[PDB]
Design an enzyme around this catalytic site. Structure first.
Site, PDB file in Angstrom:
ATOM      1  N   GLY A   1       0.817  -1.197   0.000  1.00 33.37           N
ATOM      2  CA  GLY A   1       0.000   0.000   0.000  1.00 33.37           C
ATOM      3  C   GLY A   1       0.854   1.252   0.000  1.00 33.37           C
ATOM      4  O   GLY A   1       2.045   1.210  -0.309  1.00 33.37           O
TER       5      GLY A   1
ATOM      6  N   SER B   1       5.961  -4.851   0.956  1.00 29.62           N
ATOM      7  CA  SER B   1       6.769  -3.748   1.466  1.00 29.62           C
ATOM      8  C   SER B   1       6.227  -3.140   2.758  1.00 29.62           C
ATOM      9  O   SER B   1       6.923  -3.105   3.779  1.00 29.62           O
ATOM     10  CB  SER B   1       6.869  -2.673   0.385  1.00 29.62           C
ATOM     11  OG  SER B   1       5.595  -2.122   0.110  1.00 29.62           O
ATOM     12  N   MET B   2       4.979  -2.661   2.743  1.00 27.52           N
ATOM     13  CA  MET B   2       4.416  -2.096   3.965  1.00 27.52           C
ATOM     14  C   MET B   2       4.082  -3.192   4.964  1.00 27.52           C
ATOM     15  O   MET B   2       4.217  -2.997   6.176  1.00 27.52           O
ATOM     16  CB  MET B   2       3.173  -1.267   3.659  1.00 27.52           C
ATOM     17  CG  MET B   2       3.360  -0.151   2.651  1.00 27.52           C
ATOM     18  SD  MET B   2       4.837   0.863   2.884  1.00 27.52           S
ATOM     19  CE  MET B   2       4.674   1.358   4.599  1.00 27.52           C
TER      20      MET B   2
ATOM     21  N   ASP C   1      12.854  -6.472  -6.041  1.00 33.15           N
ATOM     22  CA  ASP C   1      11.994  -7.349  -5.259  1.00 33.15           C
ATOM     23  C   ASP C   1      12.778  -8.536  -4.715  1.00 33.15           C
ATOM     24  O   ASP C   1      13.497  -9.213  -5.454  1.00 33.15           O
ATOM     25  CB  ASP C   1      10.828  -7.836  -6.115  1.00 33.15           C
ATOM     26  CG  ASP C   1       9.917  -6.708  -6.552  1.00 33.15           C
ATOM     27  OD1 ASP C   1      10.181  -5.549  -6.172  1.00 33.15           O
ATOM     28  OD2 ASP C   1       8.936  -6.981  -7.275  1.00 33.15           O
TER      29      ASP C   1
ATOM     30  N   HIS D   1      10.882  -4.377  -0.993  1.00 32.39           N
ATOM     31  CA  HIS D   1      11.415  -3.664  -2.144  1.00 32.39           C
ATOM     32  C   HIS D   1      11.445  -2.179  -1.807  1.00 32.39           C
ATOM     33  O   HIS D   1      11.032  -1.761  -0.722  1.00 32.39           O
ATOM     34  CB  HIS D   1      10.592  -3.950  -3.401  1.00 32.39           C
ATOM     35  CG  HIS D   1       9.193  -3.424  -3.342  1.00 32.39           C
ATOM     36  ND1 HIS D   1       8.876  -2.119  -3.644  1.00 32.39           N
ATOM     37  CD2 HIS D   1       8.026  -4.030  -3.022  1.00 32.39           C
ATOM     38  CE1 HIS D   1       7.574  -1.941  -3.509  1.00 32.39           C
ATOM     39  NE2 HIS D   1       7.034  -3.086  -3.132  1.00 32.39           N
TER      40      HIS D   1
END
Ligand SMILES: Nc1ncnc2c1ncn2[C@@H]1O[C@H](COP(=O)(O)OP(=O)(O)O)[C@@H](O)[C@H]1O
Lengths: 192, 341, 192, 56, 192
Positions: A67, A96-97, A170, A121
């Site tokens: 997000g 990521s988040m 990634d 990432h």
């Protein structure tokens, strides 16, 4: 449709939703994409749970594809601000988040399921306009990347340089590999 | 037999109760008056002096019942107690309020004079509030005077054929209770009304004084929000708040009181010829254990008894032992009290 | 979707919404793009709280990317009009209008989390039509620009000239930098 | 148990699921406190008159 | 529209939903495409059921055409984690994800209706971007493929080689055929 559940108490029987019932047990669900509206809901739950017992741990189940960074940081700051420790459990996917919020839990209370996948990432973004405006936004996102990497290195324990190189693209990590990297402390396989 | 002055009542009350300095003064004059009037039927005028009931709002294991009991012991008068949760309105299976009058007379040994000078102690007044109301309506009258038919059963089945009626307008009704939540109600009226948020004040700093200082600012309106009907509050003019026993208090309670647990065990061991000591280090640790399990003052006996159980089982079967020094490790169970003879 | 909670008191049990439960504690959430509908709801919350107790502070948590100026100024005028002081807390993001409503809080009660971003820029607009009509709208938006800058300088404490140059283009500011400019008074990192 | 039960009721390993599962019996009874008797339905005066208790 | 049912007990009459009523009987429904929102809902139900009676079995009805791999693994890990045995019953169809969660039930407590259809195949996916990024995702999905086959072989009792050859393409197995393969133990025809 969200099922209903009955809770027997002294006053009698009380009806609750499956999600609300678990909230009574200090359990918060972080599902779907991270946005402003969803983040504020999680923040309200954390602040609410703190009032009843500031000494009881809070459980945050994370399953999300990622997000916006701004909304996630709101949850991250709230977790560190509140007195009770926040236990993060990864089920399914952690982007990521999701991974950043997963490793932001209390040291020693970050769990992960054996078949869960963790991805990390660098931030994404963009801007269309004049060169002067692009320079401003370009420097802004760059600072965010550095600020995020600094925090990731703090919780995981890895060096800043290692976090930078590993996040250039990634990077997929499994539950055992996550433990080695420091994103989690243990793996939950079976009860007890 | 001149009644004991308020000071005397307070100084003595301290001996058996450590802390609660404000409530001590309140319950000193309140009784000095409740009896100064009863011993003077007239008032050198046509005035008819009334009664002032006491509302003991304090936390659990703070000394609410103890104060009422120890205060009656200073004098020579009957003492009774009850439980509001064990009462119900009329027409229902639940025990009737008149039953409390029965128990009061029994303790009085079938006498009116004594019973008239008695101090009943209702308890657990909380939890029978609105959404309860019916049970609070019946008690509302008894506390402010009512004649009641006392079933004639007991000593010689109570020979009096008039059901030994008794005026309930001279009995000091010390109605206590632990109003769980009042502290929050008061905080929303005397300080910031925000309990949740980044700018609120979460109570996690082990501030045991908070409840005491907050309760001291109690007002009738605060009780209305709690549920208590306005009429009941009016019948209880006097209000005395009790603080929360801290670690220092418990330490003092283990040594200072004339009937302190430490002295009790010291007395029995002295009968056997062996002395007993309690290192200050051990005492503070015992206190911390009580707070950990929230057992309260009532749990002190269990802790000390468990640590001295084995010792008691071996002292009478041993010889040359004349001294014991309880150490910090004895209570946790990792050591055994050394016998230095 | 939205979890429900219960408030246990001597009177009994009452089922409340997570957002409604916090409203009792004088907490208002400003999430998402600013518009007339959401702004009107926030105004109603402020007026209702004023009626309950005009002497207790109101907390406003701001996390939004900006929005309509008219809707935003309605909240500003409502915060200064009501007697209670309004405390503003920045969570995650505060854009042009969000930052204007952040610095507009009561002095000494403007807070910001450490990992937060604040942006300020001149207002945006446009109009299609006759030349004489464009002059009217063009002249009107300029007044708003100067009018808004005058308020920012008053709350922040900076000079009008400095605000004009800084707001010429997008200016991103972190929590420590916001304190220097005067947009906020303190940073909340940990409880006590 | 309720008096000595800490933690959530529903959740993963962190949470304690031993509620139903019988593990030990004498252990809980050994740590009995008069406060527990109150919940069971015994007036405080009665449990306060019996200071000693022997778990079998 | 979900109908409302009545439950008679010596506590008072209570109106329940058809799905919520069956939840009280340790019955969970898995319908439609598997995704994060429904997966987290099933996970919550499982954790709630073990709290009421962690010894009784939990029944899971599976009628779905498949779904996301991450969402399914969340349910799989939760099933194998909780103490009570999870009984899987296949009604209608069970695709790749549905079949994995079907054979993941407790040994000897996996059932299938006589006319039910089962399908198993390798996972799907795809990525558009730079070649370096494609290699990262290409290796990730391959790891999942091998991981799923290993788990499938464990529950079905077949060899890893047989699973790979059979799952290379779509393989439809009827109820009697699924018993031989090992995906299920018995078939329910009539209430005996
Ligand atoms: N200040 C104190 N001094 C001595 N004992 C105390 C004190 N406070 C509480 N206690 C102990 O607590 C018990 C009474 O508790 P009580 O105050 O009646 O609880 P509650 O107020 O909930 O009725 C007694 O056994 C007494 O020894």
């Amino acid at each position: 449709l969200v099922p209903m559940v009955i809770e027997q108490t002294s006053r009698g029987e009380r009806s609750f939703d499956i999600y609300s019932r678990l909230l009574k047990e200090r359990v918060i669900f972080l599902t779907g994409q991270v946005e402003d509206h969803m983040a504020n809901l999680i923040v309200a739950q954390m602040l609410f749970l703190e009032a009843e017992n500031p000494e009881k741990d809070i459980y945050l189940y994370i399953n999300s594809p990622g997000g916006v960074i701004t909304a996630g940081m709101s949850i991250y700051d709230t977790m560190q601000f509140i007195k009770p420790d926040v236990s993060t459990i990864c089920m399914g996917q952690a982007a990521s988040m999701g991974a950043f919020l997963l490793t932001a839990g209390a040291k020693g209370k970050r769990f992960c399921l054996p078949n869960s996948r963790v991805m990390i990432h660098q931030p994404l973004g963009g801007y269309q306009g004049q060169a002067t405006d692009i320079e401003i936004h370009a420097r802004e996102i760059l600072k965010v990347k550095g600020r995020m990497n600094e925090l990731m290195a703090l919780h995981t324990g890895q060096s800043l340089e290692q976090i930078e190189r590993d996040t250039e693209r990634d990077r997929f990590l499994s539950a055992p590999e996550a433990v080695e990297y420091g994103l989690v402390d243990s793996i939950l396989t079976h009860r007890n | 037999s001149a009644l004991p002055t308020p000071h005397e009542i307070r100084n003595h009350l301290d001996d058996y109760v450590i802390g609660q300095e404000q409530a001590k003064k309140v319950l000193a004059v309140a009784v000095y008056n409740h009896y100064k009037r009863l011993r003077n039927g007239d008032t050198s005028n046509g005035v008819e002096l009334g009664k002032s009931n006491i509302l003991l709002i304090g936390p659990t294991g703070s000394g609410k019942t103890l104060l009422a009991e120890t205060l009656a012991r200073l004098l020579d008068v009957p003492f009774t107690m009850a439980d509001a949760t064990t009462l119900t309105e009329a027409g229902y299976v639940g025990e009737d309020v008149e039953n409390i009058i029965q128990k009061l007379l029994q303790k009085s040994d079938y006498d009116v004079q004594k019973a008239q000078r008695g101090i009943v102690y209702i308890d657990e007044i909380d939890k029978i509030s609105r959404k309860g109301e019916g049970v609070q309506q019946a008690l509302l009258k008894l506390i402010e005077g009512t004649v009641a038919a006392v079933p004639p059963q007991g000593g010689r089945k109570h020979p009096q054929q008039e059901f030994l009626q008794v005026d309930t307008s001279k009995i000091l009704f010390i109605c206590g209770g632990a109003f769980a939540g009042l502290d929050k109600v008061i905080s929303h009226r005397v300080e910031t009304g925000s309990g949740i948020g980044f700018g609120a004040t979460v109570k996690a700093k082990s501030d045991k004084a908070s409840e005491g200082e907050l309760l001291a600012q109690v007002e009738p309106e605060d009780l209305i929000k709690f549920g208590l009907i306005p009429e009941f509050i009016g019948r209880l003019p006097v209000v005395a708040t009790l603080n929360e026993l801290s670690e220092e208090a418990l330490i003092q309670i283990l040594k200072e009181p004339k009937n302190a647990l430490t002295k009790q065990y010291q007395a029995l061991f002295n009968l056997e010829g062996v002395d007993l000591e309690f290192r200050d280090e051990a005492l503070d640790a015992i206190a911390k254990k009580a707070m950990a399990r929230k057992t309260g003052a009532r749990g002190l006996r269990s802790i000390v008894e468990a640590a001295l159980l084995d010792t008691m089982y071996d002292l009478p079967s041993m010889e040359d032992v004349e001294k014991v020094v309880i150490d910090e490790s004895v209570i946790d169970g990792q050591s055994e009290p050394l016998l230095i003879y």
